[PDB]
Amino acid sequence: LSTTTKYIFVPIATIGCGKTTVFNTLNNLFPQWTHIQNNNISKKAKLKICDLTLLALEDDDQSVVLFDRNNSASRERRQIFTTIDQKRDEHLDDTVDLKYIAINFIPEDLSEEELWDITYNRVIQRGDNHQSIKSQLDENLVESVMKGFIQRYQPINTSRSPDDQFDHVIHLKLSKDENSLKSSLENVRIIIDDLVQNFPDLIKEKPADELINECFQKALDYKP
Ligand SMILES: Nc1nc2c(ncn2[C@H]2C[C@H](O)[C@@H](COP(=O)(O)OP(=O)(O)O)O2)c(=O)[nH]1
């Protein structure tokens, strides 16, 4: 009504880390949030993901964008900061404060071998919606595309440009599932607990654990 803060949640990830599952679970819990899926945008689209992000922050209704793209390379993060900063004046007045929250999907201590074993097996066993591999016809192609994102992966580094522009980093886990607890569900809980602590005015009421579980079950059983 006088000073509003908006949030862009930015993954740092590779294919199969669970971005879509985590973000769908969060959107099930918080319907007012906007999940913008790079998978669903034509590469020949007039409005690209950065444009749709700013449009989805214009109304007083709209506070949060889940920016669903890998951003494995540092240049992909730089693109977000520079484009949103250049264009936000077309959409937002000067009373709107924008915060960028990194969602780090790949732990610093994770080897490339473990990253591959977890994510590749997820994708071949359960499928993925990344535009170029959603079909699974040439399995060799799925491998080649996934290897591209890993070859380009540059870990988050908030000590220098561009990642120093993040206002906050949420560090996720990436694990084989253990004790019947899916890694992505653990990460949904990490995000929720982290926001309650660091941005209390965002989550007005923390959801019940059974609601979190149910919203995650819904995301998990979604098979397009
Ligand atoms: N076993 C297991 N599978 C998971 C978990 N999180 C997501 N998945 C499944 C759902 C998908 O079929 C596949 C890739 O997940 P995704 O959410 O589409 O990843 P992403 O490519 O959007 O980053 O892995 C998880 O925590 N455990």
PDB file of N, CA and C in Angstrom, residues 76-145:
ATOM      1  N   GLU A  76      24.227 -17.066 -16.854  1.00  0.00           N
ATOM      2  CA  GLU A  76      22.775 -17.167 -16.802  1.00  0.00           C
ATOM      3  C   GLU A  76      22.210 -16.420 -15.601  1.00  0.00           C
ATOM      4  N   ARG A  77      22.944 -16.386 -14.483  1.00  0.00           N
ATOM      5  CA  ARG A  77      22.526 -15.533 -13.369  1.00  0.00           C
ATOM      6  C   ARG A  77      22.706 -14.061 -13.714  1.00  0.00           C
ATOM      7  N   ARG A  78      23.825 -13.721 -14.353  1.00  0.00           N
ATOM      8  CA  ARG A  78      24.045 -12.332 -14.730  1.00  0.00           C
ATOM      9  C   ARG A  78      22.920 -11.839 -15.629  1.00  0.00           C
ATOM     10  N   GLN A  79      22.433 -12.708 -16.523  1.00  0.00           N
ATOM     11  CA  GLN A  79      21.337 -12.323 -17.408  1.00  0.00           C
ATOM     12  C   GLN A  79      20.109 -11.904 -16.618  1.00  0.00           C
ATOM     13  N   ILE A  80      19.793 -12.641 -15.553  1.00  0.00           N
ATOM     14  CA  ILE A  80      18.606 -12.329 -14.766  1.00  0.00           C
ATOM     15  C   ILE A  80      18.746 -10.963 -14.106  1.00  0.00           C
ATOM     16  N   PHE A  81      19.838 -10.756 -13.364  1.00  0.00           N
ATOM     17  CA  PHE A  81      20.047  -9.480 -12.682  1.00  0.00           C
ATOM     18  C   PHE A  81      20.003  -8.316 -13.669  1.00  0.00           C
ATOM     19  N   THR A  82      20.753  -8.425 -14.765  1.00  0.00           N
ATOM     20  CA  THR A  82      20.890  -7.280 -15.659  1.00  0.00           C
ATOM     21  C   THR A  82      19.578  -6.982 -16.374  1.00  0.00           C
ATOM     22  N   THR A  83      18.888  -8.020 -16.867  1.00  0.00           N
ATOM     23  CA  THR A  83      17.640  -7.801 -17.602  1.00  0.00           C
ATOM     24  C   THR A  83      16.536  -7.272 -16.691  1.00  0.00           C
ATOM     25  N   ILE A  84      16.369  -7.866 -15.504  1.00  0.00           N
ATOM     26  CA  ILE A  84      15.317  -7.392 -14.607  1.00  0.00           C
ATOM     27  C   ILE A  84      15.625  -5.977 -14.130  1.00  0.00           C
ATOM     28  N   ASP A  85      16.891  -5.696 -13.804  1.00  0.00           N
ATOM     29  CA  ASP A  85      17.243  -4.338 -13.390  1.00  0.00           C
ATOM     30  C   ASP A  85      17.028  -3.330 -14.519  1.00  0.00           C
ATOM     31  N   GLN A  86      17.290  -3.714 -15.777  1.00  0.00           N
ATOM     32  CA  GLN A  86      17.099  -2.783 -16.894  1.00  0.00           C
ATOM     33  C   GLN A  86      15.635  -2.486 -17.174  1.00  0.00           C
ATOM     34  N   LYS A  87      14.757  -3.464 -16.989  1.00  0.00           N
ATOM     35  CA  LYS A  87      13.385  -3.372 -17.440  1.00  0.00           C
ATOM     36  C   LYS A  87      12.381  -3.126 -16.329  1.00  0.00           C
ATOM     37  N   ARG A  88      12.787  -3.224 -15.061  1.00  0.00           N
ATOM     38  CA  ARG A  88      11.794  -3.158 -13.995  1.00  0.00           C
ATOM     39  C   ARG A  88      11.068  -1.820 -13.979  1.00  0.00           C
ATOM     40  N   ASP A  89      11.736  -0.731 -14.373  1.00  0.00           N
ATOM     41  CA  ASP A  89      11.057   0.570 -14.417  1.00  0.00           C
ATOM     42  C   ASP A  89       9.908   0.619 -15.421  1.00  0.00           C
ATOM     43  N   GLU A  90       9.863  -0.298 -16.390  1.00  0.00           N
ATOM     44  CA  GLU A  90       8.714  -0.341 -17.286  1.00  0.00           C
ATOM     45  C   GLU A  90       7.468  -0.858 -16.585  1.00  0.00           C
ATOM     46  N   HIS A  91       7.626  -1.558 -15.467  1.00  0.00           N
ATOM     47  CA  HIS A  91       6.536  -2.275 -14.817  1.00  0.00           C
ATOM     48  C   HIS A  91       6.292  -1.843 -13.383  1.00  0.00           C
ATOM     49  N   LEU A  92       7.332  -1.468 -12.651  1.00  0.00           N
ATOM     50  CA  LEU A  92       7.217  -1.236 -11.220  1.00  0.00           C
ATOM     51  C   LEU A  92       7.545   0.217 -10.896  1.00  0.00           C
ATOM     52  N   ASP A  93       6.790   0.796  -9.965  1.00  0.00           N
ATOM     53  CA  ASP A  93       7.109   2.120  -9.448  1.00  0.00           C
ATOM     54  C   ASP A  93       8.234   2.024  -8.418  1.00  0.00           C
ATOM     55  N   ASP A  94       8.702   3.183  -7.956  1.00  0.00           N
ATOM     56  CA  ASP A  94       9.885   3.220  -7.109  1.00  0.00           C
ATOM     57  C   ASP A  94       9.602   2.801  -5.670  1.00  0.00           C
ATOM     58  N   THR A  95       8.355   2.492  -5.320  1.00  0.00           N
ATOM     59  CA  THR A  95       8.076   1.989  -3.977  1.00  0.00           C
ATOM     60  C   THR A  95       8.236   0.480  -3.865  1.00  0.00           C
ATOM     61  N   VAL A  96       8.522  -0.205  -4.963  1.00  0.00           N
ATOM     62  CA  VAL A  96       8.631  -1.658  -4.976  1.00  0.00           C
ATOM     63  C   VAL A  96      10.093  -2.043  -4.800  1.00  0.00           C
ATOM     64  N   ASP A  97      10.372  -2.870  -3.796  1.00  0.00           N
ATOM     65  CA  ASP A  97      11.715  -3.361  -3.520  1.00  0.00           C
ATOM     66  C   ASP A  97      11.799  -4.813  -3.977  1.00  0.00           C
ATOM     67  N   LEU A  98      12.778  -5.116  -4.821  1.00  0.00           N
ATOM     68  CA  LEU A  98      12.949  -6.452  -5.389  1.00  0.00           C
ATOM     69  C   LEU A  98      14.090  -7.152  -4.673  1.00  0.00           C
ATOM     70  N   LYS A  99      13.836  -8.365  -4.193  1.00  0.00           N
ATOM     71  CA  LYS A  99      14.888  -9.182  -3.610  1.00  0.00           C
ATOM     72  C   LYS A  99      15.068 -10.451  -4.429  1.00  0.00           C
ATOM     73  N   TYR A 100      16.326 -10.836  -4.634  1.00  0.00           N
ATOM     74  CA  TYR A 100      16.680 -12.034  -5.384  1.00  0.00           C
ATOM     75  C   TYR A 100      17.152 -13.066  -4.375  1.00  0.00           C
ATOM     76  N   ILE A 101      16.514 -14.236  -4.366  1.00  0.00           N
ATOM     77  CA  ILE A 101      16.881 -15.302  -3.440  1.00  0.00           C
ATOM     78  C   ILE A 101      17.373 -16.484  -4.256  1.00  0.00           C
ATOM     79  N   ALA A 102      18.653 -16.815  -4.099  1.00  0.00           N
ATOM     80  CA  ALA A 102      19.193 -17.996  -4.757  1.00  0.00           C
ATOM     81  C   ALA A 102      18.711 -19.252  -4.052  1.00  0.00           C
ATOM     82  N   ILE A 103      18.322 -20.250  -4.842  1.00  0.00           N
ATOM     83  CA  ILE A 103      17.977 -21.577  -4.333  1.00  0.00           C
ATOM     84  C   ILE A 103      19.041 -22.521  -4.868  1.00  0.00           C
ATOM     85  N   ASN A 104      19.997 -22.904  -4.024  1.00  0.00           N
ATOM     86  CA  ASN A 104      21.150 -23.664  -4.495  1.00  0.00           C
ATOM     87  C   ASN A 104      20.853 -25.156  -4.424  1.00  0.00           C
ATOM     88  N   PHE A 105      20.742 -25.796  -5.584  1.00  0.00           N
ATOM     89  CA  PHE A 105      20.319 -27.185  -5.636  1.00  0.00           C
ATOM     90  C   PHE A 105      21.482 -28.159  -5.565  1.00  0.00           C
ATOM     91  N   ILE A 106      22.710 -27.687  -5.762  1.00  0.00           N
ATOM     92  CA  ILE A 106      23.864 -28.587  -5.826  1.00  0.00           C
ATOM     93  C   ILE A 106      24.843 -28.253  -4.703  1.00  0.00           C
ATOM     94  N   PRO A 107      24.916 -29.074  -3.652  1.00  0.00           N
ATOM     95  CA  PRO A 107      25.816 -28.769  -2.534  1.00  0.00           C
ATOM     96  C   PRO A 107      27.263 -28.642  -2.983  1.00  0.00           C
ATOM     97  N   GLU A 108      27.992 -27.747  -2.302  1.00  0.00           N
ATOM     98  CA  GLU A 108      29.379 -27.469  -2.659  1.00  0.00           C
ATOM     99  C   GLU A 108      30.240 -28.721  -2.593  1.00  0.00           C
ATOM    100  N   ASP A 109      29.940 -29.632  -1.662  1.00  0.00           N
ATOM    101  CA  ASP A 109      30.740 -30.829  -1.440  1.00  0.00           C
ATOM    102  C   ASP A 109      30.333 -32.007  -2.325  1.00  0.00           C
ATOM    103  N   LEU A 110      29.442 -31.806  -3.289  1.00  0.00           N
ATOM    104  CA  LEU A 110      28.951 -32.908  -4.104  1.00  0.00           C
ATOM    105  C   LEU A 110      29.873 -33.130  -5.292  1.00  0.00           C
ATOM    106  N   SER A 111      30.299 -34.366  -5.481  1.00  0.00           N
ATOM    107  CA  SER A 111      31.140 -34.624  -6.630  1.00  0.00           C
ATOM    108  C   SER A 111      30.296 -34.673  -7.899  1.00  0.00           C
ATOM    109  N   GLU A 112      30.967 -34.424  -9.029  1.00  0.00           N
ATOM    110  CA  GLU A 112      30.290 -34.507 -10.319  1.00  0.00           C
ATOM    111  C   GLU A 112      29.739 -35.906 -10.539  1.00  0.00           C
ATOM    112  N   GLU A 113      30.486 -36.919 -10.087  1.00  0.00           N
ATOM    113  CA  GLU A 113      30.051 -38.305 -10.207  1.00  0.00           C
ATOM    114  C   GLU A 113      28.732 -38.550  -9.478  1.00  0.00           C
ATOM    115  N   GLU A 114      28.628 -38.090  -8.222  1.00  0.00           N
ATOM    116  CA  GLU A 114      27.385 -38.242  -7.465  1.00  0.00           C
ATOM    117  C   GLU A 114      26.265 -37.402  -8.071  1.00  0.00           C
ATOM    118  N   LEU A 115      26.580 -36.179  -8.501  1.00  0.00           N
ATOM    119  CA  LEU A 115      25.575 -35.353  -9.159  1.00  0.00           C
ATOM    120  C   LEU A 115      24.989 -36.080 -10.361  1.00  0.00           C
ATOM    121  N   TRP A 116      25.856 -36.689 -11.163  1.00  0.00           N
ATOM    122  CA  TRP A 116      25.393 -37.426 -12.330  1.00  0.00           C
ATOM    123  C   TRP A 116      24.567 -38.638 -11.926  1.00  0.00           C
ATOM    124  N   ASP A 117      25.071 -39.432 -10.969  1.00  0.00           N
ATOM    125  CA  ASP A 117      24.372 -40.661 -10.602  1.00  0.00           C
ATOM    126  C   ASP A 117      22.959 -40.361 -10.104  1.00  0.00           C
ATOM    127  N   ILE A 118      22.798 -39.304  -9.300  1.00  0.00           N
ATOM    128  CA  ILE A 118      21.481 -38.990  -8.750  1.00  0.00           C
ATOM    129  C   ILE A 118      20.564 -38.450  -9.837  1.00  0.00           C
ATOM    130  N   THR A 119      21.021 -37.427 -10.557  1.00  0.00           N
ATOM    131  CA  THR A 119      20.121 -36.744 -11.487  1.00  0.00           C
ATOM    132  C   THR A 119      19.856 -37.563 -12.744  1.00  0.00           C
ATOM    133  N   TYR A 120      20.877 -38.219 -13.313  1.00  0.00           N
ATOM    134  CA  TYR A 120      20.641 -39.000 -14.526  1.00  0.00           C
ATOM    135  C   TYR A 120      19.682 -40.152 -14.255  1.00  0.00           C
ATOM    136  N   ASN A 121      19.859 -40.841 -13.128  1.00  0.00           N
ATOM    137  CA  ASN A 121      18.964 -41.944 -12.819  1.00  0.00           C
ATOM    138  C   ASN A 121      17.545 -41.449 -12.553  1.00  0.00           C
ATOM    139  N   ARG A 122      17.403 -40.288 -11.905  1.00  0.00           N
ATOM    140  CA  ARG A 122      16.082 -39.680 -11.780  1.00  0.00           C
ATOM    141  C   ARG A 122      15.430 -39.477 -13.141  1.00  0.00           C
ATOM    142  N   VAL A 123      16.187 -38.964 -14.104  1.00  0.00           N
ATOM    143  CA  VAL A 123      15.586 -38.561 -15.368  1.00  0.00           C
ATOM    144  C   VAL A 123      15.225 -39.777 -16.211  1.00  0.00           C
ATOM    145  N   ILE A 124      16.072 -40.811 -16.238  1.00  0.00           N
ATOM    146  CA  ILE A 124      15.757 -41.960 -17.084  1.00  0.00           C
ATOM    147  C   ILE A 124      14.656 -42.805 -16.454  1.00  0.00           C
ATOM    148  N   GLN A 125      14.615 -42.862 -15.123  1.00  0.00           N
ATOM    149  CA  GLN A 125      13.643 -43.704 -14.435  1.00  0.00           C
ATOM    150  C   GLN A 125      12.279 -43.033 -14.372  1.00  0.00           C
ATOM    151  N   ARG A 126      12.261 -41.723 -14.145  1.00  0.00           N
ATOM    152  CA  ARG A 126      11.033 -41.011 -13.851  1.00  0.00           C
ATOM    153  C   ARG A 126      10.677 -39.946 -14.872  1.00  0.00           C
ATOM    154  N   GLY A 127      11.576 -39.614 -15.783  1.00  0.00           N
ATOM    155  CA  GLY A 127      11.291 -38.629 -16.797  1.00  0.00           C
ATOM    156  C   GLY A 127      11.566 -37.211 -16.327  1.00  0.00           C
ATOM    157  N   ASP A 128      11.677 -36.315 -17.302  1.00  0.00           N
ATOM    158  CA  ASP A 128      11.909 -34.906 -17.032  1.00  0.00           C
ATOM    159  C   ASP A 128      11.172 -34.096 -18.088  1.00  0.00           C
ATOM    160  N   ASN A 129      10.881 -32.840 -17.754  1.00  0.00           N
ATOM    161  CA  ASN A 129      10.093 -31.987 -18.630  1.00  0.00           C
ATOM    162  C   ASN A 129      10.935 -30.942 -19.354  1.00  0.00           C
ATOM    163  N   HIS A 130      12.260 -30.981 -19.197  1.00  0.00           N
ATOM    164  CA  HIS A 130      13.130 -30.111 -19.980  1.00  0.00           C
ATOM    165  C   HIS A 130      12.824 -30.273 -21.465  1.00  0.00           C
ATOM    166  N   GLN A 131      12.654 -29.136 -22.148  1.00  0.00           N
ATOM    167  CA  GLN A 131      12.022 -29.121 -23.468  1.00  0.00           C
ATOM    168  C   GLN A 131      12.695 -30.086 -24.440  1.00  0.00           C
ATOM    169  N   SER A 132      14.025 -30.109 -24.460  1.00  0.00           N
ATOM    170  CA  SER A 132      14.758 -30.867 -25.464  1.00  0.00           C
ATOM    171  C   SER A 132      14.804 -32.369 -25.195  1.00  0.00           C
ATOM    172  N   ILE A 133      14.374 -32.833 -24.019  1.00  0.00           N
ATOM    173  CA  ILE A 133      14.553 -34.234 -23.642  1.00  0.00           C
ATOM    174  C   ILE A 133      13.269 -34.843 -23.088  1.00  0.00           C
ATOM    175  N   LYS A 134      12.170 -34.080 -23.098  1.00  0.00           N
ATOM    176  CA  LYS A 134      10.928 -34.556 -22.493  1.00  0.00           C
ATOM    177  C   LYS A 134      10.400 -35.817 -23.175  1.00  0.00           C
ATOM    178  N   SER A 135      10.848 -36.102 -24.401  1.00  0.00           N
ATOM    179  CA  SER A 135      10.350 -37.240 -25.165  1.00  0.00           C
ATOM    180  C   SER A 135      11.025 -38.556 -24.800  1.00  0.00           C
ATOM    181  N   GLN A 136      12.331 -38.540 -24.516  1.00  0.00           N
ATOM    182  CA  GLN A 136      13.103 -39.728 -24.131  1.00  0.00           C
ATOM    183  C   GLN A 136      13.299 -40.704 -25.288  1.00  0.00           C
ATOM    184  N   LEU A 137      13.238 -40.234 -26.534  1.00  0.00           N
ATOM    185  CA  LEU A 137      13.378 -41.162 -27.659  1.00  0.00           C
ATOM    186  C   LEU A 137      14.827 -41.611 -27.817  1.00  0.00           C
ATOM    187  N   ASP A 138      15.706 -40.725 -28.279  1.00  0.00           N
ATOM    188  CA  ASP A 138      17.127 -41.057 -28.275  1.00  0.00           C
ATOM    189  C   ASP A 138      17.643 -40.848 -26.862  1.00  0.00           C
ATOM    190  N   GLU A 139      17.800 -41.949 -26.127  1.00  0.00           N
ATOM    191  CA  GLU A 139      18.362 -41.863 -24.787  1.00  0.00           C
ATOM    192  C   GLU A 139      19.742 -41.219 -24.807  1.00  0.00           C
ATOM    193  N   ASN A 140      20.509 -41.443 -25.878  1.00  0.00           N
ATOM    194  CA  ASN A 140      21.812 -40.801 -26.017  1.00  0.00           C
ATOM    195  C   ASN A 140      21.689 -39.284 -26.031  1.00  0.00           C
ATOM    196  N   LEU A 141      20.576 -38.764 -26.549  1.00  0.00           N
ATOM    197  CA  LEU A 141      20.387 -37.319 -26.586  1.00  0.00           C
ATOM    198  C   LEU A 141      20.128 -36.764 -25.191  1.00  0.00           C
ATOM    199  N   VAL A 142      19.308 -37.460 -24.401  1.00  0.00           N
ATOM    200  CA  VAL A 142      19.094 -37.067 -23.007  1.00  0.00           C
ATOM    201  C   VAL A 142      20.430 -36.947 -22.288  1.00  0.00           C
ATOM    202  N   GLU A 143      21.298 -37.938 -22.480  1.00  0.00           N
ATOM    203  CA  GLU A 143      22.606 -37.900 -21.841  1.00  0.00           C
ATOM    204  C   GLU A 143      23.403 -36.682 -22.291  1.00  0.00           C
ATOM    205  N   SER A 144      23.432 -36.423 -23.605  1.00  0.00           N
ATOM    206  CA  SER A 144      24.236 -35.332 -24.149  1.00  0.00           C
ATOM    207  C   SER A 144      23.765 -33.975 -23.643  1.00  0.00           C
ATOM    208  N   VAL A 145      22.452 -33.759 -23.598  1.00  0.00           N
ATOM    209  CA  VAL A 145      21.931 -32.482 -23.116  1.00  0.00           C
ATOM    210  C   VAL A 145      22.228 -32.308 -21.634  1.00  0.00           C
TER     211      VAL A 145
END
